[PDB]
Amino acid sequence: EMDKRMKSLAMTAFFGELSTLDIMALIMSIFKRHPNNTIFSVDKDGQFMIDFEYDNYKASQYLDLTLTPISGDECKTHASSIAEQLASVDIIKEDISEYIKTTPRLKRFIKKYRNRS
């Protein structure tokens, strides 16, 4: 089930700073857990996001987002965001340590997480 600390941090200290990709990288980094699959989605405001599906939850749930599967037409509309996020996912997977290290908000997040006070 979802980690209560990660959720809290994502919704306060890092409110609005994190993407579903960030959440996937952090889950990988903190918990060594990988998604089962990816879902091409869009949010309330037609922003494209790859969402990540795990055993009992999605990455988007850490951000309290209500996303919807992309339609056929939105595939064309979001082709550029699709290619950038795919490219990022492969980067994250290749060396999660380097990504956390070189992504300032993620590195900060790991610090805030590893310190309950």
Side-chain angles (χ1 to χ4, degrees), residues 2-3 5-31 34-43 45-46 48-65 67-110 112-113 115-117:
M2 298 169 60
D3 183 61
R5 183 160 179 72
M6 175 172 296
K7 182 55 180 303
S8 176
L9 267 44
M11 299 296 298
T12 55
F14 298 83
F15 177 64
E17 289 192 52
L18 300 174
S19 68
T20 48
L21 271 79
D22 292 333
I23 289 301
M24 181 275 287
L26 288 170
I27 287 175
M28 189 180 292
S29 171
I30 294 164
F31 303 103
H34 291 73
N36 296 344
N37 199 17
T38 61
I39 296 168
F40 283 16
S41 316
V42 288
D43 67 7
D45 302 316
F48 170 85
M49 315 172 166
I50 299 176
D51 197 7
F52 304 90
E53 192 160 35
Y54 300 77
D55 289 323
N56 319 109
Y57 62 90
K58 308 178 194 294
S60 51
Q61 293 177 224
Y62 273 109
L63 301 178
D64 279 348
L65 301 180
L67 299 173
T68 57
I70 60 174
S71 67
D73 310 321
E74 306 179 304
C75 186
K76 176 166 157 194
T77 296
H78 302 287
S80 292
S81 306
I82 281 164
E84 64 176 333
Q85 299 186 32
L86 287 171
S88 292
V89 168
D90 286 352
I91 295 296
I92 297 179
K93 286 195 272 179
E94 164 68 18
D95 190 345
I96 179 53
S97 269
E98 179 72 359
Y99 195 71
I100 296 298
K101 192 183 175 175
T102 60
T103 311
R105 65 193 178 276
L106 300 192
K107 178 176 171 173
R108 295 198 294 277
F109 184 104
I110 296 307
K112 178 75 186 180
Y113 188 87
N115 296 121
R116 284 63 168 182
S117 72

